[PDB]
Point group: D2
Chain length 245, copies 4
């Protein structure tokens, strides 16, 4: 039971971190959750187990994002697992969460690394959305997990932030596009998300603590439900006040 | 009831977004102080409505924008809370009350300006300042702003100015109350059907609907439900922010 | 230069700091400038003298802002001064620069001080714009000096930030309002700026203010003045309703 | 002229905004590298116009968004720079080159996507990376973004994604390059008449004109004159920002 009973959801990159927590949370609201990961079937199944242990419903879906054919593989697996469990291909909630980072100075960024950041973080989300319009009913949900680094300068992750900048444009423009179909499209921006180095990252928030994976997941689940029907095209700041300069 | 055994004050609460906000917060198990400037009866009609759902609420009278406004309000509030809970703890503060100008820029007088500032910006500042002594660590402050802070409309410039002032309150009090774990956030409504004579008129309603990407006017419920979320535990990691409850009016 | 030759301007709070430098840069570009100040007639005459030494044109205007009759006196003096030197009351450029800070913790703010900050920082600029519309021609300019404190949290000056967030709303709605008359309306947001005070004589404090800028220096009054001058000229005809970040990258974090 | 003694590269300066930017920078006395993909005559026409007005410019030819683009661009750039100044100093970099998608969201192919990224966001990044050694302390990077980063338009979502990436390039390199005194800023045009067929129909024009509060479309000089200000000394204290050169298109 819960807000999302009889709803289906897909969360990309949800074997670890925010994705995992988001899947758990959405499942807790009574949603059927496709747990996606790129490479680890094991981690993906740990998540599916937890959801079942806590009385919810989920299934793992493996498909490496960032490579030719990623969208085919994601949906082939996804659409089957859905018809298997509901006899429909409907996808009520899409969470674009998967993302990889750069971790080098701009002078060390290769054309190839740039291509891959774009491919996983921005290109996949675009073509995942495009194909998912097929499955998403009227009144459905799209939620894109952004990054605090889009509002906060960090040259050590410039290529990463560029791709998340790109992802945030999905929110603005698909919100407009999907208006007539009553599908809301929003972004969620985390802060820093989980020694003496702990003490310094905790300083960035006004709450003097580091973010937890739950801190973001709870905002996603709100966006995923009916209480958020009148919010679209917007950016939700789940960073514990990190943007306040 | 996720807000059970919590207390809430919503200013300008006898009608419109305020009404719906009180009703929603009550429905979540919170005892709600329903504030009004003038009509004791209208504020009691809301209290009535809440109790018929198995909720807890009490009316409060205090004309905002005049000398001693804050005093009268917190006098009645502290009284009503003690009588009902043996404490005067205020978990949730919603600054909802506000008035518009409805004249062109060249037609604004000093008296109107002063009046807009007094009700829309001054009162909320001092209601926050006073409420600090009643809000526990982990409490909630929600300021109802306006989409006109992001969408040009000269016909309400002075009103928007007072609301932009309100949002700055949000920014700075959020930083100030971080160590006490109180979130401070603004909710910006779009065009919302309250009950004014413009909404009696279709074609006018048709015009306003088009501002939203969903092709409808907002309902009071649309905004109250966003307020309710910020009031709850799911929004503990959101502070100092502006939530866009306009149905995508800001998209251009 | 002669870019603003034939133009007139008013810069409020123009005897000191950012206001002063703005008045100076406008005059340099060829504008006849009304230097306003609230009380100090001498400091205003000093700016005028400086502008004249450089071969420009300026006059002083006394009018205390934030008290009853402030707009009235300002424009009485403005109009007399403009008519004498040009034969017209045409006001091409209006710069809303004047403002006062609160300098008090959010708990010590009284209803009086709040009124005072509003009256000076929000009320006056609104009514100055309102009254100035009668003098500003099609093609004219309005620049509002805001604050980086609208973008950067600082509870120490919260009431002041509210008045300045009010001021940004002026920019947004009047830009829309004044579109059909081809007047641009923009905001300029300073960061920390060295206004000549003793505070800036201490290097240890200078350094910790400098760190807020990506360039590792404090701003000069001239860094802000030069942006205002750009907005005020023809090259910025296609910018309106916007906010210019003249703070040396303070908002980057 | 403010830019006497300085050099500038403007990518895609053979027509539209790039062309006018090149022309305006040369007018202030800068030596301008005029760039485009293959059309030598197109680049040279801009060079001709600049020379008539008594300025200095040379054409440089490199198709952006293909393996080797950067190498080919800088080889041509330095050659031409050395032939004229006997130095490879680049004072001013303007990332203007850009292409549009122009198909519905459902129609976008991986191929089109890759192409927009490669030209609009990736090339600017690697051009910057490579230019860093030629740009002296106190120099300038100006990135030509788009109002579509703030104004919803599904017909160009992929394009707008690349411009969102572009604005991130501004934010992060502004920080990275601060200790070197290099300002990095975005200029975001609205609808600007660039000679394409759409600006010929006086009906679609009137419609486009209505996006601005001045009720006209932008001209190429409207944007170029903003770039020129950023390229000069008067804008030394602005960095990491977005300049809204749309004539008030983002006001709602
Ligand atoms: N005009 C508008 O409405 C508008 C609005 C917002 C933003 N913008 C932005 O402003 C910039 C220029 O706009 P515009 O309207 O002036 O464009 P334009 O008239 O189409 O000219 C663009 C220039 O970019 C060059 N270019 C395109 N692809 C290239 C490639 N792969 N390699 C090398 N050069 C390339 C073109 O040269 P070749 O022909 O040789 O390729 C051309 O000189 C773009 O970044 C655009 O996104 C324009
Ligand atoms: C010139 C054009 O063929 C027409 C067009 O559709 C457009 C194009 C490029 C743009 O950057 C924009 C726009 C735009 O409308 C438009 C409409 C409203 C706001 C905008 O920022 C824009 C644009 O930025 C391609």
């Amino acid at each position: 039971s819960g807000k999302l009973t009889g709803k289906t959801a897909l969360v990309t990159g949800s074997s670890r971190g925010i994705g995992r927590a988001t899947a758990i949370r959405l499942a807790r609201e009574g949603a059927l959750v496709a747990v996606h990961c790129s490479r680890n079937r094991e981690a993906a199944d740990e998540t599916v187990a937890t959801i079942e242990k806590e009385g919810g419903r989920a299934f793992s879906v493996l498909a490496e994002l960032g490579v030719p054919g990623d969208v085919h593989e994601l949906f082939l697996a996804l659409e089957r697992g859905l018809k298997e469990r509901t006899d429909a291909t409907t996808l009520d909630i899409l969470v674009n969460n998967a993302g990889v980072m750069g971790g080098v100075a701009p002078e060390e960024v290769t054309p190839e690394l740039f291509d891959r950041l774009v491919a996983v973080n921005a290109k996949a989300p675009f073509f995942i959305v495009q194909r998912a319009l097929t499955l998403i009913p009227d009144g459905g949900r799209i939620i894109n997990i952004s990054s605090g680094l889009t509002r906060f300068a960090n040259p050590q992750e410039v290529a990463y932030a560029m791709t998340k900048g790109a992802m945030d444009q999905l929110t603005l423009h698909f919100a407009k596009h999907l208006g007539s179909r009553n599908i809301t499209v929003n972004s969620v921006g985390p802060g820093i998300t989980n020694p003496e180095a702990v003490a310094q990252m905790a300083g960035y928030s006004v709450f003097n603590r580091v973010g937890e994976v739950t801190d973001v997941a709870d905002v996603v689940a709100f966006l995923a439900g009916d209480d958020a029907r009148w919010i679209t095209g917007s950016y939700l700041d789940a960073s514990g006040g990190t943007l306040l300069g």
